[PDB]
Design a protein around this ligand. Structure first.
Ligand code: HEM
Ligand code: HEM
Ligand code: HEM
Ligand code: HEM
Lengths: 141, 146, 141, 146
């Protein structure tokens, strides 16, 4: 559950991320495969090397979903029904993995936003990533 | 933990640049702002009402420096983290009864803090190495629960 | 996020608790305090003896909250709003404990509603308690 | 782990009445129903598309027996759960990489199954005795991580 403040915070920081979302989404994925190689088991057919055009493209995809979630913060369950179907029902991703991409995405943002990643932003972005994770790990269809 | 030859090298190189009077408080600081229930264990620290109170709190800075010191110790004994953290594990597990999950959260926001400071220098490979450490440490602190 | 099946299952089940709610909430609590001694730090002044009338009284309030939670299953943040402040703002309860009480509620239920506690219902009930717990652990006011 | 003698007898008495052909399957099945992501680990069992499918799956009931057995062992070596499960921890930690939280979830669904079958007999005190065994087994299994 996001407080009006969390939403204000999320929309604000995500705006700051601006055009760089896809990039960050890709850097997040890479940080995760490196730090937690077990996550790689989910992307067997992907080329997970550093410059992977595949990882870069999947990254834009992860970011647009987030940008979408940020845009429908009040209506995420409905907003992300497809993705939830994909992750919860279809891929059955261990929810432990979301805390990992979440952490890697925060770390990514911490490394790119030395001027805007404030404790409050960090906190709101964490709660936000957690909701998103809760939605994609719930079989509510 | 493991840490390859080049890894410990990276960890070490980076830690040398860590400000020991500030980072500890930055992490313990964000631990409280981001994971608010952790504040239940620091009521004796004073005003933690807002992120500004938390971050600018004297006891949070002074305590965090100690936390940072436990990490530095870890870095010097990566091949014996559980031994290094034995005392702390009894304190955090048997005395304070801190759920091990928070040991993991502190370790991660630490990483975020390190990331926030080093920016581009905190590369995925560098982060990867630090996750190893922070995982050893957390596991070490939770040893008394095993 | 609860599926429509979950709301069905949860209501079917919880409704069978009826007049038993206060008792079951008490038993869950006791089960919790006995099984996870640390949870007792949140009730220091509390008389937690086996028959504690205080415990029985408290479990009545807990169990009723859950009934109200079930009723407004599509609006728990508004419904449980006050309980959220209490647990998250005021009590700063560590989220882990909500997993223990939940499990204890579940054990209690299973011990009392053998026929109703089917895998599917046990599944909804878990999800449900997982939502209540999220709400009660989120600061949004 | 430490079980009072009075506890070890309550646990022992109860377990002697446990249907060793079914209990493990009920527990494994509910794990998969209640925590669907765990299914990814047993996808070769076949049809697990629904609760009844899961609970009706032969390989689930079959494999469940092995699980219950493991529990019977630890129950016969509460003094050395870590060593008793060294081989299982190698399997679940190094080969499968099952997150240690899942080990806790299975023990807990076992506890719900025991409550389900014994009803009122599974008293708070007896449950607590079981939460000890169960947490110890999970810890033992996660040993290869620790
Ligand atoms: C907030 C977290 C996450 C978001 C927003 C997210 C979003 C997405 C999106 C947008 C897709 C594209 C699917 C399509 O083309 O329709 C996708 C696919 C996928 N996601 Fe995630 N995801 C998240 C977490 C996870 C986690 C942590 C894992 C597991 C480690 C994961 C594994 C997958 C896999 C394996 C695919 C399919 C990839 C492929 O085969 O092309 N995702 N995700
Ligand atoms: C890797 C993580 C952690 C490390 C390395 C660590 C390290 C330390 C150290 C060095 C001390 C001070 C020892 C002394 O008394 O001189 C300490 C004390 C303490 N820690 Fe931690 N800690 C960690 C995580 C946590 C977490 C997650 C919590 C709970 C949210 C926590 C709560 C406390 C408390 C309450 C004290 C005593 C403070 C006081 O009353 O003065 N610690 N910790
Ligand atoms: C299923 C989740 C839970 C529900 C539905 C719930 C509900 C409630 C309710 C109704 C109250 C009493 C309000 C009143 O009497 O006016 C309350 C108080 C309280 N709860 Fe919870 N609770 C939950 C989880 C927890 C957990 C996990 C803990 C900690 C182990 C906890 C600790 C407390 C404490 C410390 C109080 C205050 C007792 C006092 O000082 O009188 N609760 N809760
Ligand atoms: C509570 C702790 C658990 C116990 C007592 C346990 C015990 C066992 C035992 C007895 C085996 C058979 C080993 C052999 O003879 O080769 C096994 C295999 C296995 N377990 Fe566990 N297990 C536990 C939890 C889990 C969890 C939580 C998962 C993952 C969701 C899991 C996934 C598996 C897998 C994949 C296998 C092999 C299945 C296959 O044949 O394909 N186990 N476990």
């Amino acid at each position: 559950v996001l407080s009006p403040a969390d939403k204000t915070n999320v929309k604000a920081a995500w705006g700051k991320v601006g055009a760089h979302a896809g990039e960050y989404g890709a850097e997040a994925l890479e940080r995760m495969f490196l730090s937690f190689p077990t996550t790689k088991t989910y992307f067997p057919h992907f080329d997970l090397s550093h410059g992977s055009a595949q990882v870069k493209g999947h990254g834009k995809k992860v970011a647009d979903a987030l940008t979408n979630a940020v845009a429908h913060v009040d209506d995420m369950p409905n907003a992300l029904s497809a993705l939830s179907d994909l992750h919860a029902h279809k891929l059955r991703v261990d929810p432990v993995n979301f805390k990992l991409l979440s952490h890697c995405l925060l770390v990514t943002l911490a490394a790119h936003l030395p001027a805007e990643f404030t404790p409050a932003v960090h906190a709101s972005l964490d709660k936000f990533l957690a909701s998103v994770s809760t939605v994609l790990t719930s079989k509510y269809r | 933990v493991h840490l390859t030859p080049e890894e410990k090298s990276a960890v070490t190189a980076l830690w040398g640049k860590v400000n020991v009077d500030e980072v500890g408080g930055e992490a313990l600081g964000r631990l409280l702002v981001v994971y608010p229930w952790t504040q239940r264990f620091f009521e004796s620290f004073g005003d933690l009402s807002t992120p500004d109170a938390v971050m600018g709190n004297p006891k949070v800075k002074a305590h965090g420096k100690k936390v940072l010191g436990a990490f530095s110790d870890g870095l010097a004994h990566l091949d014996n983290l559980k031994g290094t953290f034995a005392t702390l594990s009894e304190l955090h597990c048997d005395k304070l009864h801190v759920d091990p999950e928070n040991f993991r959260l502190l370790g991660n926001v630490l990483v975020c803090v390190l990331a926030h400071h080093f920016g581009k220098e905190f590369t995925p490979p560098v982060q990867a190495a630090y996750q190893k450490v922070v995982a050893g440490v957390a596991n070490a602190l939770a040893h008394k629960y095993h």
